[PDB]
Symmetry: D2
Subunit: 116 residues, 4 copies
């Protein structure tokens, strides 16, 4: 797939399982339209969000629900969620992996962009 998200937990040394996330695309009128959503698997990965044909140029936002993740583990974290906002496919189609590492008071995100 053209868009994959991988989430790790830095406190437990594990994938971050069952993390909900919502993906949005910026519409012509500048509002965020819902695009896709899902939750991470046992390997901390979310696959199958979109297709090469559907995933056209645009500005996309991945909102990762890190707060609910930590709350379910008994932890009151700093962030409400983690956000990744980026322009996709501006120079033709690419494949995007969004990776996030989570701690209660910190998060780090990186992107791997590969040419099909």
């Amino acid at each position: 797939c053209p868009l994959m998200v991988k989430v790790l937990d830095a406190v437990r040394g594990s994938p971050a399982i069952n993390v909900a996330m919502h993906v949005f695309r910026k519409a012509a009128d500048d509002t965020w339209e819902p695009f896709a959503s899902g939750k991470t698997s046992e390997s901390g990965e979310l696959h199958g969000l979109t297709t090469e044909e559907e995933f056209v140029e645009g500005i996309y936002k991945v909102e990762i629900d890190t707060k609910s993740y930590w709350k379910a583990l008994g932890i009151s974290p700093f962030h409400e969620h983690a956000e990744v906002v980026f322009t996709a496919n501006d120079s033709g189609p690419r494949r995007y992996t969004i990776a996030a590492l989570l701690s209660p008071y910190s998060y780090s995100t990186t992107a791997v962009v590969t040419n099909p």
Copy 2:
């Protein structure tokens, strides 16, 4: 100040200077109400965003304009900006330092919350 932001550049090993950011508080209708902004100093810090009287409990967003920063350096960045969204003061006023580390395809944010 109850709220300070510090921005660092991981490519150059320096404070990230002249980085613009806006701070928003979530309104009753779920919309983001702007209330403070500024740009980072020569030490990569932005102070004086708010006061303890004004900085009441609520959900706050800091939107850091990282894209403009990398553009000014001639480096093509991945992100449109970096956001930090958090609930403040859940059990009394705290001093918040939000630190952001920037790379062209990555960013990290950490909070130091003291009493």
Copy 3:
């Protein structure tokens, strides 16, 4: 395999390819004995360093040659190398993924530990 290393580049948004690393194990006399070595593939991964039978309890050190990586890209980085030192298999065999994200003046490392 019981030990895998994955390295990403935060400047280029890519796996970190051809990164050399050496793995050591602490001997009875407290010296670091060479254990395994290799370099990352096109996917930024190093597999096949050891086997479940060879990878006994002990303290291990993974030394990742980040300086040569950056130098080959024209960059003079801060760190000489990135080190990960840990006790492995203290409570029975586990599988270990060591993940590193690299920038010229920063590096971050995390571990995913899974029970076979």
Copy 4:
């Protein structure tokens, strides 16, 4: 000081206090020669490790005892310690701030190098 270390705790959102560290310089025979040490203050900082006269070019290692830190908190950590190895002063003396962020299974280090 030409060299300062700052340690932060990503589980608790605080300075990591009373964290022990040792600093080494690489000797002619490729061995690590200890020369400075200390533990972090209430603000998670360790200052006064060296002077500009003493802090000559060379390869330096800071070994931070993160395992003892997590043990004191009753948390089982992954790493034996966190190391930072770097060449100093390659083109004149710089002030170095090394910042380390700690989680039980992760650590990150960043350098801010100023003139």
